[PDB]
Structures are given as C-alpha cells and as structure tokens.
Amino acid sequence: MIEKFIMAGPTALHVCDSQKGDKCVVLLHGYLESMLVWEDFVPFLYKELRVVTLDLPGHGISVVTGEEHSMEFLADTVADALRALGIPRCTLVGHSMGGYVALAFCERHPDMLNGVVLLSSTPNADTPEKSENRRREIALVKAGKKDALARVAPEAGFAEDNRTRMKDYIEDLTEQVAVTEDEGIVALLNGMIARKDQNEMLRASKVPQLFILGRKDNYIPVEAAEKMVKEHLQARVVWLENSGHMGFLEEPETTARAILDFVNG
Numbered sequence: 612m613i614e615k616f617i618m619a620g621p622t623a624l625h626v627c628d629s630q631k632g633d634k635c636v637v638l639l640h641g642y643l644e645s646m647l648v649w650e651d652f653v654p655f656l657y658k659e660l661r662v663v664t665l666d667l668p669g670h671g672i673s674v675v676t677g678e679e680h681s682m683e684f685l686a687d688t689v690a691d692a693l694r695a696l697g698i699p700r701c702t703l704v705g706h707s708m709g710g711y712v713a714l715a716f717c718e719r720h721p722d723m724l725n726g727v728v729l730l731s732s733t734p735n736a737d738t739p740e741k742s743e744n745r746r747r748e749i750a751l752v753k754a755g756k757k758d759a760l761a762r763v764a765p766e767a768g769f770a771e772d773n774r775t776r777m778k779d780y781i782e783d784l785t786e787q788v789a790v791t792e793d794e795g796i797v798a799l800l801n802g803m804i805a806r807k808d809q810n811e812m813l814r815a816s817k818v819p820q821l822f823i824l825g826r827k828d829n830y831i832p833v834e835a836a837e838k839m840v841k842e843h844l845q846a847r848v849v850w851l852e853n854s855g856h857m858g859f860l861e862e863p864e865t866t867a868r869a870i871l872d873f874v875n876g
Contacts, residue, residue, distance in 0.1 A: 612653060612662070619692035622674055625666040626692060629653065632661030634725070634874055635701040637693065639709030640664075641732075642799060643764050643788055645671030648706070652859045655867035660874060663701070665692065667712065669795030669802075679801035686715035690723055702874045704728040707830070707856065708799065714809040717818050726819040726873055730866070731831055731856045733839050734809035745800045752793050760796070761788035768856035770827035780860050813843055820846035821873045823866060825854035847873065 612627040627646055636656055640648050646664040653662045666673040668688060669680045676684070689712065693701060702725050705713030710732020717727045737745070751759050765784035769777045813820060820843065824836045831839075840848050849869040854861040 612657070612664070615696075617692060617695050619688050619695060622668065622676070622688050622691070624668075624688060624692045625672040626696070627664045628696065629657040629662040632657070632659070634659075635661040635663060635698050636870060636874060637663040637665075637689070637698075637701045637703050639667065639689070639703065639705040639712050640670065641705075641707035641709045642803070643670075643760065643784065643791060643796075644706065644709075645787055645791070647671070647783070647787065649859070652863055652867065655863055656870065659871060661698075663693075663696070663698065665689065667709070667799070669799040670791055673792075673795065675792055675794045675798055678798060679805060680795075680798040681802050682711050682715040682806045683719060685712040685802070686719055689716060690720045693723060699723060700725050702726045702728065702870070704730055704870060705732055706730045706859070707732050708803060711803060711806050711809075714812065715806075717816055718809065718812045721816060721818050724818045726821065727816075728821045728823060728870060728873065730823045731825055731828060731858060733831060733835070734813055735839075736806060736808040737804055742804045745804050749797050749800050752796050757788065757791075757793055757796065761785050764788075767829050770825065770853060770855035770861060771829075772827070773853070773855070773857075773861050777857070777860060780857070810842060814845065819873070819876075821869065822846050822848045823851065823858055823869055824848065825851045825856060825858050825861070827853065828855040830856050 615626045703713045710729040765781045851858040859866045
C-alpha cells in the first residue's frame with residue numbers, strides 16, 4: 612500500500628493505494644474506525660486486485676467541514692478522489708457507516724461502480740432510538756468525554772465469543788478513538804442521524820449488490836438481517852456464521868473470498 616495525500620476536488624483526502632491491478636476494490640471503514648482497520652485485510656485482496664483505502668472526513672487523518680458530514684458529501688468526496696486517482700470504476704465495500712456512504716455513492720455515482728458491497732450495513736434510516744443515542748454521544752464528546760465512547764464500541768462489534776481471540780484488535784480500536792477528532796465524531800454522527808432510507812434506491816439500481824452479514828452481530832441481529840435480505844431479491848448474500856459486525860477481522864479469508872468472487876462476477 613502506497614500512502615497518498617490528494618485533493619479530492621476541494622477536500623484533501625488521506626488514501627492508501629496498492630496501485631497494481633486491472634480491477635479495483637475500494638474499502639470504506641465505519642464509525643470510530645479509520646483506514647487502519649483494514650491493515651490485516653488488504654493482503655487477502657491486493658495480489659489479485661488494486662486495493663484503495665481512505666480516511667473518511669471526520670475520522671482518521673482527515674478534514675472536518677462544519678457540524679455535519681452528510682452521506683452525500685462523503686460519497687461525493689470519494690468519487691472526486693477516485694477520479695483524481697484515475698480509477699473510473701471500482702467495487703465499493705462499505706463497513707457499517709462506510710456502507711451508508713457506499714449507498715449514497717451508489718445513488719449519486721453508479722457509473723463509477725462495478726458493484727457495491729454492504730459489509731454489516733443496512734439501507735434503513737436511523738431509528739428514533741438510535742438517533743437519540745447518537746445525540747447522547749454528541750453530548751458526551753462536547754463535554755470532553757470522548758473517552759467514554761472507547762469503552763463499549765470497540766468490543767461490541769465482535770461476536771461475543773470472539774472477544775478473547777480478537778483482543779488485540781479491540782485494543783487497536785480503543786486506541787483509534789483517542790486519535791479521532793472530537794469535531795469529526797460529531798460531524799459523522801449528525802450525518803448518520805440525517806441519512807436517507809436507501810432501500811428503494813437499491814432495488815432500482817443497476818449496480819450489482821452483495822450483502823456480507825454476520826450471524827452473531829449485536830448491531831444487526833439475525834431477524835433484522837433476514838428482513839433486509841428478503842426485501843432485496845437482486846442482492847447476493849454471504850452469511851458469516853462466526854462473525855458479528857467485524858467479519859473482515861473475525862473471518863478474513865472467508866470475507867475476502869466473498870469479495871473476490873463478487874468482483875470476478
């Protein structure tokens with residue numbers, strides 16, 4: 612992976628790019644993650660594909676523009692970055708929050724997609740209860756208590772029975788929170804509160820779709836996931852039997868195989 616700092620239109624962007632490959636996969640991290648979350652996953656892909664990772668505005672090393680980073684803004688930023696990199700078409704893989712960005716990208720820039728992968732993400736809007744909890748997290752951050760976010764989220768994304776095996780990644784994610792910008796967390800939380808329901812968009816889209824969904828995911832329980840699958844006949848589904856929300860760390864070879872099979876059609 613070659614590290615690059617580029618201008619995506621008006622927005623500086625931190626990217627990593629394996630450069631080599633006639634087909635390209637772009638990986639979008641989720642909430643309280645950054646490009647670093649993919650570090651052990653990219654070697655499962657970059658021998659066959661060109662792999663791009665990036666820090667979404669508000670996370671990792673990135674800009675913060677205002678009080679809200681809308682999913683449209685984030686998607687347009689990625690699109691501008693890909694054109695600047697000379698990548699006209701990619702398979703876009705979005706983890707959770709990254710999947711919400713990937714959905715706005717599928718809506719606004721489908722010409723740039725050979726396919727879209729929702730990796731433990733759904734197309735539903737925020738429930739009222741979730742938005743209330745996001746406002747609670749915004750309030751915690753503004754009060755100087757961002758550290759409180761680091762206590763639960765890093766472990767809760769894993770299947771309960773993988774917490775011991777994944778303890779090094781849980782520590783990685785804990786440390787990621789400390790170097791995530793306060794105002795970026797606020798901007799992205801407001802953006803997720805504001806995001807649209809994308810179910811009709813997906814059904815209407817000509818872009819091939821893949822869902823990768825864990826069977827032990829605290830955030831997306833099986834019955835929520837099965838309801839999503841049944842509404843999207845056009846999408847392929849891969850179930851990760853021993854993963855929660857973090858399948859690319861919990862079952863990396865299986866998750867990578869799902870993506871590689873999808874990219875090769």
